[PDB]
Amino acid sequence: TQTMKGLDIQKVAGTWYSLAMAASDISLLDAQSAPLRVYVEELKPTPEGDLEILLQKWENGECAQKKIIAEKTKIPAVFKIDALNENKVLVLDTDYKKYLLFCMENSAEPEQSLACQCLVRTPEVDDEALEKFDKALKALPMHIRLSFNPTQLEEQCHI
Ligand SMILES: [Cl-]
Ligand SMILES: [Cl-]
Ligand SMILES: [Y+3]
Ligand SMILES: [Y+3]
């Protein structure tokens, strides 16, 4: 997977909304309780170059807040995690002020664990960001794609 060259991770800080998401396995994203159905609400880069990912997940019939610490690697756009049965976070592209495309995978099973998201800065459908999302997904073996309306973006767990 091609990741972003020259990522300045400090510029991704602040509020984001999960506008769209895709996975290689349908079961990873199908239900609301599906293991990779996650909603990014905030990205908090640390001064040491790591990424605190704040997100929402639907578990036990209710919406819960999760925090994931993504550890920096030699490659600026590739981070290490230990959550959601994934071990990697990969930023594909961002303009910092509008959109951000990122993926998650488990390196042991890189085929069946892939989930990617289109994040936007405002709770609006951004078609230009969705075009770039789909252009990035072309070379990826996705079998499920989800997108959300502006009202869903502002609701807890995209209800
Ligand atoms: Cl740390
Ligand atoms: Cl709106
Ligand atoms: Y660290
Ligand atoms: Y509007």
Swiss-Prot record:
It is found in: Secreted. Synthesized in mammary gland and secreted in milk. Its main location: secreted. Disulfide bonds join C63-C157, C103-C116, C103-C118. The keyword Isomerase does not apply. Primary component of whey, it binds retinol and is probably involved in the transport of that molecule. This is Beta-lactoglobulin. It comes from Bos taurus (Bovine).
